[PDB]
Design a protein around this ligand. Structure first.
Ligand SMILES: CC(C)CCC[C@@H](C)[C@H]1CC[C@H]2[C@@H]3CC=C4C[C@@H](O)CC[C@]4(C)[C@H]3CC[C@]12C
Lengths: 27, 34, 37, 121, 115, 105, 26, 118
């Protein structure tokens, strides 16, 4: 279960970073 | 059981502080680019 | 409960390492920024 | 009727018999005197309560009674039997506590950030 | 009996271990690998070592009215620090490290631009 | 009459030779059996006040004892050598985040 | 002890909020 | 004189008492004698795999032939629990990992930064 938690955390973290990049580009 | 629980609490706190630090670094890099 | 402790300490080492790398990136970032500004 | 109050913090343990709050009361441990016996000054009684340290699970965890002056231990029918795995500088917190502390951290950092941002106009 | 007075105290479910010897004497001291670190005063007979999670070790000796008796050593392994080294966690090691350093390189690449 | 508290490997029990009366605390699960009460699992922190009278030969004398177990499996060992460091580095982090966001305008 | 529930849903919860806010703003 | 040396590797443990150039070596645990017409016990080699904490612990003696197991210099208490493929790390390990991490990340980041600057 901690393995799944860390994997999900990393995937969602990368998604957050890329979406911050895309949002800050469109401003 | 006692030692394990503090290990979990410490790893959670350190993960939170990691998220805060990465937000800081993103903010700084964005500012230097503007 | 031993497996939970092993995974816990592995994650703690992971995150300490990630903190170290984030600190070095902050150091280079702030050096460059204070140089430019 | 009034139940005994027990407070366990670190290793020191405080034990109270609140039946008689207007006077002093001695203490017993399976009709054997303990505390303040000219030796082992760590284990000692108080004016109204008990104060024990280096608590052991194997020994010193049995039947306790509070008794007035010159009173047989079998007079009072309200005894005391407790068990404790004393954990020095080590308390218990449940998941709502850590959730609230994390929420407090988020609230304070967000409030500080919003305040400095608004202050900068 | 057998010049082996030192005997480790067992049957303690808590996080602490003890040792004892059967000897009567006054103002007894203890030896750690033969050096003067240990001391015992009156009113106390069983010496305390420490928690089993602190990984204690070394030599320990007891003596009484008899001359210098025959010591013994203890060893402990409870770690609470060991990390997994199977393929199920080193793969995560490498994935996390590579992803993080790649993100770092992308950031520094963009930083090396406007100047 | 001192009430004896028996203890199995993972079961905690209270036994006395008359009806046991509940006034305050936790019983665990309701028990229809008389002259015996089952409390609950060892790791449940059972708190409670239990009251039962004397036996037939010991009629007309009450016997009330308070039972508490502190055997915690959810307690945390608090080390001052780590919490201080983590709180001080969090303070530094929020200070410097405030500095960075202030620099933004 | 507290196991995953204290550590899994806690930070994943707030960061999920971060993603949702980001999507709406964008 | 010298303490008994133990080097636990994986789930297998190792131990012997080599304090003599030439001498007979035995091994006893609560005065038992097993082996000689699970446990690895040789005339000069002792080992044990699957080291269970509960059923494998206690006292150990390594004393040459010719007497009872009550004259050797010292005993040994070995309360040890071991998992499958779990290396244990200590002060020397963490410092080396941190310093090599610094070296690797600094070198690669400098390389990419300098290459990107053109
Ligand atoms: C994860 C951290 C450490 C590094 C991630 C890199 C981030 C901070 C960088 C990579 C590329 C960058 C973007 C590149 C170009 C632009 C366009 C400009 O008009 C506004 C800023 C903006 C939108 C930048 C914002 C910051 C940015 C998204």
């Amino acid at each position: 279960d901690p393995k799944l938690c860390y994997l999900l955390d990393g995937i969602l973290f990368i998604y957050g970073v890329i979406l911050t990049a895309l949002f800050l580009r469109v401003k | 059981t006692e030692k394990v629980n503090m290990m979990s609490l410490t790893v959670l706190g350190l993960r939170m502080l990691f998220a805060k630090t990465v937000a800081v670094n993103f903010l700084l890099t964005a500012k230097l680019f503007f | 409960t031993l497996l939970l402790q092993l995974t816990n300490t592995s994650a703690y080492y992971m995150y300490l390492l990630l903190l170290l790398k984030s600190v070095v990136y902050f150091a280079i970032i702030t050096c460059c920024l204070l140089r430019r500004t | 009727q009034t139940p005994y109050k027990v407070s366990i913090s670190g290793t020191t343990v405080i034990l109270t018999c609140p039946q008689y709050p207007g006077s002093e009361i001695l203490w017993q441990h399976n009709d054997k005197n303990i505390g303040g016996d000219e030796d082992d000054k760590n284990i000692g009684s108080d004016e109204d309560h008990l104060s024990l340290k280096e608590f052991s699970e194997l020994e010193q965890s049995g039947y306790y009674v509070c008794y007035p002056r010159g009173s047989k231990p079998e007079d009072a029918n309200f005894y005391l039997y407790l068990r404790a795995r004393v954990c020095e500088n080590c308390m218990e917190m449940d998941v709502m506590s850590v959730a609230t502390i994390v929420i407090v951290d988020i609230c304070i950092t967000g409030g500080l950030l919003l305040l400095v941002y608004y202050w900068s106009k | 009996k057998g010049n082996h007075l030192v005997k480790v105290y067992d049957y303690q479910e808590d996080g602490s271990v003890l040792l004892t010897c059967d000897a009567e004497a006054k103002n007894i001291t203890w030896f750690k690998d033969g050096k003067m670190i240990g001391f015992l005063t009156e009113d106390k007979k069983k010496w305390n070592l420490g928690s089993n999670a602190k990984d204690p070790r070394g030599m320990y000796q007891c003596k009484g009215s008899q001359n210098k008796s025959k010591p013994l050593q203890v060893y402990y392994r409870m770690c609470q620090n060991c990390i997994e080294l199977n393929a199920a966690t080193i793969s995560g090691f490498l994935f996390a490290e590579i992803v993080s350093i790649f993100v770092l390189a992308v950031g520094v690449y963009f930083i090396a631009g406007q100047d | 009459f001192k009430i004896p508290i028996e203890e199995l490997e993972d079961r905690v029990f209270v036994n006395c030779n008359t009806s046991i009366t509940w006034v305050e605390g936790t019983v665990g699960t309701l028990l229809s059996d008389i002259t015996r009460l089952d409390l609950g699992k060892r790791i449940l922190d059972p708190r409670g006040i239990y009251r039962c009278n004397g036996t037939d030969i010991y009629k007309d004398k009450e016997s009330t004892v308070q039972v508490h177990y502190r055997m915690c499996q959810s307690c945390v060992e608090l080390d001052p050598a780590t919490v201080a460091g983590i709180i001080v580095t969090d303070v530094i982090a929020t200070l410097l985040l405030a500095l960075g966001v202030f620099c933004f305008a």
